[PDB]
């Protein structure tokens, strides 16, 4: 708070506010997140610790961790812009396919790395995917649902986005697998391509039903065990599955086949980040530099 001079407020994470700040000593510009209170569960520091020791080009680097008076500060390397802003800025023309491919490929490397270190992101969304002028994209905000909790909002009455939530989460599964991050990334990939959220739900049930309306109401054939899930209701409407050709035009067939594997209902059939990296869609992958307006 003192060694840092809050330059500007950057956002409202689901755990606290993020500020752009400068280290009045080292002159470095960083992203500082203030964590939301009555003791600060130490159990989380462990989670945090593993994070600082995590080092990969596609994961935002956690520089310093500061615990002081129910207040937990996380100091991250500062990235230039988030993917939400970039997508909005690119809405008239769309992000060029080679860049979409580059970003997806890089995020999959980020996830493959996290997942191999047994770390789950849990809340991937455009707002927490950060980019720089050099063409990189990194994963920020690693949820920390176990390292903290999922009350009702972000921290001060704010509409949490459910658009990228995997169906198994929406159906009440208490234990998520790495597959939930692949689902979220698939939703994001579709969005980059079409310039419209794939499943823009405004409530958990609306989110679930929009998924059902597009991918078809799941049943025991495509998703063994689904009818026994916590929030599953035999009374759910039975919608037929729509063709991907209609869901994500003009994504070429390789892109659509990859997307379909990222959006399989069954967490166990859903493609892994490692396997996704070997998908033919990335045969011609390159690393373009984006036109960023900072
Ligand atoms: N590292 C890092 N850099 C950031 N910069 C940034 C600059 C401009 C825009 S923008 N709306 O495009 O102009 C957006 C972001 S944000 C962030 C970060 O790490 N957030 C974060 C989020 C949630 C939890 C958490 F712990 C950290």
Domain ranges of the chain: 1-80, 81-291
- Give the residue, by CA position, lying nearest to ligand 1 atom 19: 140
Atom index in ligand 1 nearest the CA of residue 60 equals 1
- Ligand 1 nearest-atom number relative to CA 84: 12
Q: Is 290 left (phi over 0), alpha (psi -120 to 50) or beta?
A: beta
Question: Which residue puts its alpha carbon closest to atom 12 of ligand 1?
Answer: 81
What is the 3-state secondary structure of the chain? CCCEEEEEEEEECCCEEEEEEEECCCCCEEEEEEECCCCCCCHHHHHHHHHHCCCCCCECCEEEEEEECCEEEEEEECCCEEHHHHHHHCCCCCCCHHHHHHHHHHHHHHHHHHHHCCCCCCCCCHHHEEECCCCCEEECCCCCCCCCCCCCCCCCCCCCCCCCCCHHHHCCCCCCCCHHHHHHHHHHHHHHHHCCCCCCCCCHHHHHHHHHHHHCCCCCCCCCCHHHCCCCCCCCCCCCCCCHHHHCCCCCHHHHHHHHHHCCCCCCCCCCHHHHHCCHHHCCCCCCCCCCCC
Ligand 1 site, residue 10, Cβ cutoff 6 A: yes
Which of 19, 79, 139 maximizes ligand 1 atoms within 8 Å of its Cβ, making it the mutation to test the pocket?
79
Sheet of 81-82: strands edge to edge? 81-82, 129-131, 137-139
CATH for 1-80 is 3.30.200.20
Catalytic, 123? Answer yes
Task: Decide whether any atom of ligand 1 lies within 6 Å of the 85 Cβ.
Answer: yes
Ligand 1: which atom is nearest the Cα of residue 127?
Answer: 14
14 Cβ below 6 A of ligand 1: no
78 ligand 1 Cβ < 6 A:
yes
Binding-site entries: 10-18, 33, 77-79, 82, 125-128, 141
CATH level 3 topology of 81-291: Transferase(Phosphotransferase); domain 1 (1.10.510)
Give which of 118, 114, 92, 111 is closest to 189, Cα–Cα. Answer: 111
Residue indicated by tokens 């991907």: 244
Whether ligand 1 lies within 6 angstroms of the CB of 74 is answered as yes
Q: What is the resolution of this structure in A?
A: 2.0
């Amino acid at each position: 708070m003192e060694n840092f001079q809050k330059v500007e407020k950057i956002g409202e994470g689901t755990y606290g506010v993020v500020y752009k700040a400068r280290n009045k000593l080292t002159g470095e510009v960083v992203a500082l997140k203030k964590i939301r209170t009555e003791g600060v569960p130490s159990t989380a520091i462990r989670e945090i610790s593993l994070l600082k020791e995590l080092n990969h080009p596609n994961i935002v680097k956690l520089l310093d961790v500061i615990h002081t008076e129910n207040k937990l500060y996380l100091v991250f390397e500062f990235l230039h812009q988030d993917l939400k802003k970039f997508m909005d800025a690119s809405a008239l023309t769309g992000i060029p396919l080679p860049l979409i491919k580059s970003y997806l490929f890089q995020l999959l490397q980020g996830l493959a790395f996290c997942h191999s270190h047994r770390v789950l992101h849990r809340d991937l969304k455009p707002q927490n995917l950060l980019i720089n002028t050099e063409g990189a994209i990194k994963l920020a905000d690693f949820g920390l649902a176990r390292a903290f909790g999922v009350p009702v909002r972000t921290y001060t009455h704010e509409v949490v986005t459910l658009w990228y939530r995997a169906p198994e989460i929406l159906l009440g599964c208490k234990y998520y697998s790495t597959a939930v991050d692949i689902w979220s990334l698939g939703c994001i990939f579709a969005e980059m391509v079409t310039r419209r959220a794939l499943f823009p739900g405004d409530s958990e049930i609306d989110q679930l039903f929009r998924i059902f309306r597009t991918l078809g109401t799941p049943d025991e054939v495509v998703w063994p065990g689904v009818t026994s899930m916590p929030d599953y209701k035999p009374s759910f409407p039975k919608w037929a599955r729509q063709d991907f050709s209609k869901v994500v035009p003009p994504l070429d067939e390789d892109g659509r086949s990859l997307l379909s594997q990222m959006l399989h209902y069954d967490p166990n059939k859903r493609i892994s980040a490692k396997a996704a990296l070997a998908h033919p869609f990335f045969q011609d992958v390159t690393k373009p530099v984006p036109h960023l307006r900072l």
